[PDB]
Ligand binder design. Structure first.
Ligand code: NDP
Length: 277
């Protein structure tokens, strides 16, 4: 039924949602219509995904009240400077055809450009302007975090990062936990970049509960306190991935999955912030 988690700002976010990364813009409307139909209420898009349009149409097409929906969009890398943030969100808003998004994020820190503090400053402006209910960042390291916070005194609501069994970024989640910041896992199912489902601590928890391996992972994230939003273009999967409030892995089972993280950062499948310009 998807539980909702309380953010540091007093806003609630549905623990499981649907991501649109890699869904072609042209198929984006159907893709989202289905997800809404199936039962999903939290959509994760990005200006860079080029599909805010489909997302908006779908939402419009569906009969759901805005209140029951949670839209999240993101601020692209080339828009951190000056008042580009205000221009950026406004265009997203027009694409999505909404009055306001639920959450807005700084897509990447782009540390070489040294403009993330500035972008965060502006972010705080958009929230006060009512353009977005909450603000958070994505792909920010602990140093990035400490700085933006020390600089503004405004803690981000979330931090969306690459997170899965083989690469957990514990230093970040740990920090996030002490700072009342919620973690959003991206690429929660390894983005299909490695045999996650064949993983034995994975296969073991699956058969033990009669769930699929994909479902075992999600439940892992979920029990860890993470917000997840897997992507799939297949109805079956939307349904499968949505049915995970059933079981409950065991402490030991959770331990077994956790141990999949080598600790040398070798399980990473995507880009490291220090490489994204
Ligand atoms: N803020 C950021 O920097 C980023 C955020 N994200 C967000 O996180 C989302 C999720 O990560 P994403 O990169 O999409 O990777 P995911 O880890 O969620 O994996 C998606 C892939 O796994 C498949 N999939 C989904 N469910 C299942 C299942 N039960 N069994 C088998 N395959 C399955 C999909 O195939 P198929 O669709 O064909 O079924 C697709 O190939 C993105 O869509 C986006 O919203 C992603 C990247 C970066």
């Amino acid at each position: 039924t998807v539980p909702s988690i309380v953010l540091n700002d007093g806003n609630s976010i549905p623990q499981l949602g649907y991501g649109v990364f890699k869904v072609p813009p042209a198929d984006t409307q159907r893709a989202v219509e289905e997800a809404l139909e199936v039962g999903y209420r939290h959509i994760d898009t990005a200006a860079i995904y080029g599909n805010e349009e489909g997302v908006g149409a779908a939402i419009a097409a569906s009969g759901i009240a805005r209140d029951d929906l949670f839209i999240t969009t993101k601020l692209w890398n080339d828009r951190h400077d000056g008042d580009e943030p205000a221009a950026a969100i406004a265009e997203s808003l027009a694409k999505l055809a909404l009055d306001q998004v639920d959450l807005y994020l700084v897509h990447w820190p782009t540390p070489a450009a040294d403009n993330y503090v500035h972008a965060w400053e502006k972010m705080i402006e958009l929230r006060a302007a009512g353009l977005t209910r909450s603000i958070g960042v994505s792909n920010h390291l602990v140093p990035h975090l400490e700085r933006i916070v020390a600089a503004t005194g405004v803690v981000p609501a979330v931090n969306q990062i690459e997170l899965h069994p083989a690469y957990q970024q514990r230093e970040i989640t740990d920090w996030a936990a002490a700072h009342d910041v919620k973690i959003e896992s991206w690429g929660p199912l390894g983005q299909g970049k490695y045999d996650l489902f064949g993983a034995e601590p994975v296969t073991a928890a699956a058969a033990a509960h009669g769930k699929t391996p994909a479902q075992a992972v999600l439940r892992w994230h979920l029990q860890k306190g993470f917000v997840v939003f897997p992507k799939s273009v297949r109805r079956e999967r939307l349904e499968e991935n949505l049915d995970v409030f059933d079981f409950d892995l065991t402490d030991t089972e959770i331990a077994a999955i956790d141990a999949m993280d080598p600790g040398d950062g070798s399980g990473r499948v995507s880009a490291h912030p220090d490489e994204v310009d």
